Amino acid sequence: MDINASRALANVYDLPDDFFPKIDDLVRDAKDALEPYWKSDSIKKHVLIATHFVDLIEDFWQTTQGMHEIAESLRAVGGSGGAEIHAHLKAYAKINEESLDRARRLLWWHYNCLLWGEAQVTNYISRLRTWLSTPEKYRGRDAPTIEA
Amino acid sequence: INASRALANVYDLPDDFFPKIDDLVRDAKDALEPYWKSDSIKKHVLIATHFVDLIEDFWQTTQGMHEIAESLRAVGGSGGAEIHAHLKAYAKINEESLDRARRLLWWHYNCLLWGEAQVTNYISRLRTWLSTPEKYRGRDAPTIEAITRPI
Amino acid sequence: SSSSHHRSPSPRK
Amino acid sequence: MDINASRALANVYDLPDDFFPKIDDLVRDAKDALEPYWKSDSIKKHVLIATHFVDLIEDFWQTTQGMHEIAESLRAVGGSGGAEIHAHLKAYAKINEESLDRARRLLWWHYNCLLWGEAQVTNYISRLRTWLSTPEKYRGRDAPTIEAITRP
Amino acid sequence: MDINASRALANVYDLPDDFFPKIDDLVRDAKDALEPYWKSDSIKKHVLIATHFVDLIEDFWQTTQGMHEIAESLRAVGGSGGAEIHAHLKAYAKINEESLDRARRLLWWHYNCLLWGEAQVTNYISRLRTWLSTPEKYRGRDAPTIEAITRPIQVA
Amino acid sequence: SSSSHHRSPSPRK
């Protein structure tokens, strides 16, 4: 495969939003794989970045989910609250969940690059892009995976 | 060792030592943009950039949560104290997270500009000066102009 | 650097 | 200064009971500075002594405070216990408080000597005694310190 | 230190409590054997630890004992203001007793290691634990000892 | 030319 075309086809924001493991499993794997580098106090790029995003998720994910739940409960219980309140709440939750989707994607990217290598990860992304462009019939019955 | 030490020192500060968030983010972006154009992977670059993004993403949402919670509680007739309590808890969590982000951003920005040593020494001196009981102190805090002068 | 890799992690497109 | 006069003016128990940080802060800083040596299972003087005194405080401080609380509560109640009971309890709490004050002072001493050096702390205490015997207006605006430094 | 010495000390922590000399005698002997190292201002592990533990005892032993005494006194006289009084007092005294028992045992270990040697003492304790855990009929009628004490001082 | 420092720590005066 052409390195150039691969790198051009590889981007973490192109993915379907269902390719990404649940946030709990992702955070757990990230922490369990980072513990050595933490204890060693390592200054590697992906270590630093994945640490930042682990912290970001742990901080704001449950708060955003609680905000969405609160907005729904407030619009359900009745109009006693208001429309501006629910609109502002939904907008804040929307912005936060966009930021959290970005954090999730980049945490995945950074963790997988730490494990395997960003070269392997971009190759995998390109090959998965192809697998997804192809129709179900003339492609593998199960998707690829890194060194798999 | 000394890294976590100076970090704990940074956390051991009064919250009135840290500039306003607008000034801080402005200065950080101004100092970092060249490094972005240069595609630099420096540690302080990595961390300050990511904290700037964090702040610009969540600060306004958190302040709005605070204000709307207080307003609807003053109203009193919207849902119940459950909503206000849930909102206060979330806002507290996000506030402490953003405070940590603000502090680490200050630390890394200043380390990048001037020097990690010049910032660590000043922070140690200031933390010591603040610890003491005001009778063995000096009567004049250490001022930030010490970072700017080399040694 | 052939890759964008700006502001540290991969930049959007 | 004259090194002899410095070492002679340097004694931890000369300080007026308020130069010393609070007990929680002191134990916390001591543990934070010790845990490396604890893990490395070190033998050195200051580590050993600071550890012993941390343990002593952890063990007896809260008990002594509770003893004082008990003495005051029984004093308020009046009929409970009695007079000589209150007297003996207060005397015991007082002896324990003397021991714990000595422990706090020695803990400060050894923690700081471990961080910087007992010579540095000696000079610090000496210069502080001098700077503190002088009146306020001829002191200046720069008290004495140790001022750790870092090199890139 | 050696895992042998660690085993010996962990065993000291769990001995029958009748193996240990009276605290008065222990403190006395510790002071008398340490004052030379005090004058010489030595910084040896056992010296430091024994000194600190004997000071600890000197300070808090009689205090804890009087605490017990007065707790029993208030329980006997009655008229307590709530039972929490005696509860908290005896809990404090119990924590003090645990701390002081550990102190006595480490003082014993360190003073005896100073006298004889860490090796001699850990061997002694290994033998004594093997002897105590074992039941009679396979044991020996007389316990083991540090043979350097009860061996004759021969002089021509 | 050494301080008291007896028993390992510093004594009173």
Curated annotation (Swiss-Prot), chain E:
Transmembrane segments: none annotated. One of its GO terms (cellular component) is T=4 icosahedral viral capsid. One of its GO terms (biological process) is microtubule-dependent intracellular transport of viral material towards nucleus. It comes from the Viruses. The keyword DNA-binding applies. Keywords: Capsid protein, Cytoplasmic inwards viral transport, DNA-binding, Host cytoplasm, Host-virus interaction, Microtubular inwards viral transport, Phosphoprotein, RNA-binding, T=4 icosahedral capsid protein, Viral penetration into host nucleus, Virion, Virus entry into host cell. GO terms for molecular function: DNA binding; RNA binding; structural molecule activity. Homodimerizes, then multimerizes. Self assembles to form an icosahedral capsid. Most capsid appear to be large particles with an icosahedral symmetry of T=4 and consist of 240 copies of capsid protein, though a fraction forms smaller T=3 particles consisting of 180 capsid proteins. Entering capsid are transported along microtubules to the nucleus. Phosphorylation of the capsid is thought to induce exposure of nuclear localization signal in the C-terminal portion of the capsid protein that allows binding to the nuclear pore complex via the importin (karyopherin-) alpha and beta. Belongs to the avihepadnavirus core antigen family. This is Capsid protein. It comes from Duck hepatitis B virus (strain United States/DHBV-16) (DHBV). The lineage of its organism: Viruses, Riboviria, Pararnavirae, Artverviricota, Revtraviricetes. The chain holds residues 1 to 196 of 262 of the full protein.
